[PDB]
Amino acid sequence: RPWQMKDLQAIKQEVSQAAPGSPQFMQTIRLAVQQFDPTAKDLQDLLQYLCSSLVASLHHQQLDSLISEAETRGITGYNPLAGPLRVQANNPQQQGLRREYQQLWLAAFAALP
Report how far apart, in Å, the C-alpha atoms of 15 and of each of 44, 50, 51, 72 are. 18, 9, 11, 34
Rounded Cα distance, 101 and 47, in Å = 14
Rounded Cα distance, 92 and 41, in Å = 12
Of the CA atoms within 13 Å of residue 84, those in its CB half-sphere come to: 5
Q: Where are the beta strands (DSSP E) in 15-91?
A: none
Nearest to 59 by CA among 26, 84, 28: 26
Radius of gyration of the chain measured on its C-alpha atoms = 14
Q: Does domain 5-111 match CATH 1.10.2020.10?
A: no
Resolution of the model in angstroms: 6.1
Rounded Cα distance, 96 and 75, in Å = 9
Rounded Cα distance, 43 and 100, in Å = 13
Rounded Cα distance, 23 and 78, in Å = 31
For residue 102, the one-letter residue type is Q
User: Do 105 and 21 touch, CB atoms closer than 8 A?
Assistant: no
Q: How many residues does the chain have?
A: 113
The 8 Å CB, 24+ separation contacts for 99-104 are 100/70, 100/75, 101/39, 101/40, 101/43, 101/67, 102/33, 102/34, 102/38, 102/43, 104/63, 104/66, 104/67, 104/70
Nearest to 66 by CA among 105, 98, 27: 105
User: Do 40 and 90 touch, CB atoms closer than 8 A?
Assistant: yes
SS3 state of residue 78: coil
Rounded Cα distance, 68 and 85, in Å = 10
Nearest to 27 by CA among 93, 95, 106: 106
Domain extent listing, the chain: 5-111
